[PDB]
């Protein structure tokens, strides 16, 4: 609301809070990002290193669906299945491990961050990290690749 703003308190004060000496002029310094390599060079260099120049190959017609690859860590792996899935497997005796299909949950690659509970599991995914497969293998599980 305009009743809570500075303008109401600045009534009666000449200059409206912009000073008597410098005044409020239209566009001192230029419009927009003018002066980056010039009178505004310190601000750009100080706060925006890398701003000017070119780096890396161009790629015409990038299609971001081609590189779709959502990832999940191992510390979140068991949330993709219900709770009773884990407790049932942990307490059963035949040794049967549940199947966690990360593609069904909307992930493609499995990453290695975290630790798994000591419980065998069969994991299905398009991709694995090297540490993900080791950690999955350390609990008695297996990695299954899908296309």
């Amino acid at each position: 609301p305009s009743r809570l703003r500075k303008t109401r308190k600045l009534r009666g004060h000449v200059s409206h809070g912009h000073g008597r000496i410098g005044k409020h002029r239209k566009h001192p310094g230029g419009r927009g990002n003018a002066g980056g390599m010039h009178h505004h060079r310190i601000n750009f260099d100080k706060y925006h290193p890398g701003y000017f120049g070119k780096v890396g190959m161009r790629h015409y017609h990038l299609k971001r669906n081609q590189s779709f690859c959502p990832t999940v860590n191992l510390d979140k792996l068991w949330t993709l299945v219900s709770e009773q899935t884990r407790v049932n497997a942990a307490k059963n005796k035949t040794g049967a491990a549940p199947i966690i299909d990360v593609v069904r949950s909307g992930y493609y690659k499995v990453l290695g961050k975290g630790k798994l509970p000591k419980q065998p599991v069969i994991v299905k995914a398009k991709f694995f990290s090297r540490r993900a497969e080791e950690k999955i293998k350390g609990v008695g599980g297996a990695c299954v690749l899908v296309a």
Binding site: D45, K46, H48, P49, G50, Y51, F52, K54, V55
Partner: protein, 187 residues
């Protein structure tokens, strides 16, 4: 005249919650009394943390609370946080806890109770621990916010690992000159 400076006379600090919440202020009324009429420094700390702002009251996850309540000699002590206790999906086993919080997320509540623990409000901590005895006051990570990734030496200074403010992330967005020796310089 007295040769003194007045710029520092007025101490900047909260004497009350900015919030207009009536349940919070009823708790501030409660702990204003306990802080004043009891010599328990704990009440003063809790009374102060009730005035604090949302970012000064970070949420405490379940995993962090379990870690700090597992340190030796903290058995049967009530964990106290002036803030929210959020659930942590990365936790597998939830031990029996007694906790006092301003808020507990819906999933954190079920996990604590299903483990056999007890959840309190702050009006119940007073009737159980008037002076705060047998308590373990805990706090969430204050610097666990995206803003603090942007504070410090300006990103364009030597050995500054400050995060820049960019509208986009990618090869074309602030990586050419000033960030690699092949383009002008680096620091």
């Amino acid at each position: 005249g007295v040769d003194i400076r007045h710029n520092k006379d007025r101490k900047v600090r909260r004497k009350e919650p900015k919030s207009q919440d009536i349940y919070l202020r009823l708790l501030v009324k409660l702990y204003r009394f306990l802080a004043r009429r009891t010599n328990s420094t704990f009440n003063q700390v809790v009374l102060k943390r009730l005035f604090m702002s949302r970012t000064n009251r970070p949420p405490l996850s379940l995993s962090r609370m379990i870690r700090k309540m597992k340190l030796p000699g903290r058995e049967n002590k009530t964990a106290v946080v002036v803030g929210t206790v959020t659930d942590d999906v990365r936790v597998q086993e939830v031990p029996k806890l007694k906790v006092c919080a301003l808020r507990v997320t819906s999933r954190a509540r079920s996990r604590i109770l299903k483990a056999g623990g007890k959840i309190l409000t702050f009006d119940q901590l007073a009737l159980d621990s008037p002076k705060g005895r047998g308590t373990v006051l805990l706090s969430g990570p204050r610097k666990g916010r995206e803003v603090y990734r942007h504070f410090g030496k300006a990103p364009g200074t030597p050995h500054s690992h400050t995060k820049p403010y960019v509208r986009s992330k990618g090869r074309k967005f602030e990586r050419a000159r000033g960030r690699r020796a092949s383009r002008g310089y680096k620091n």
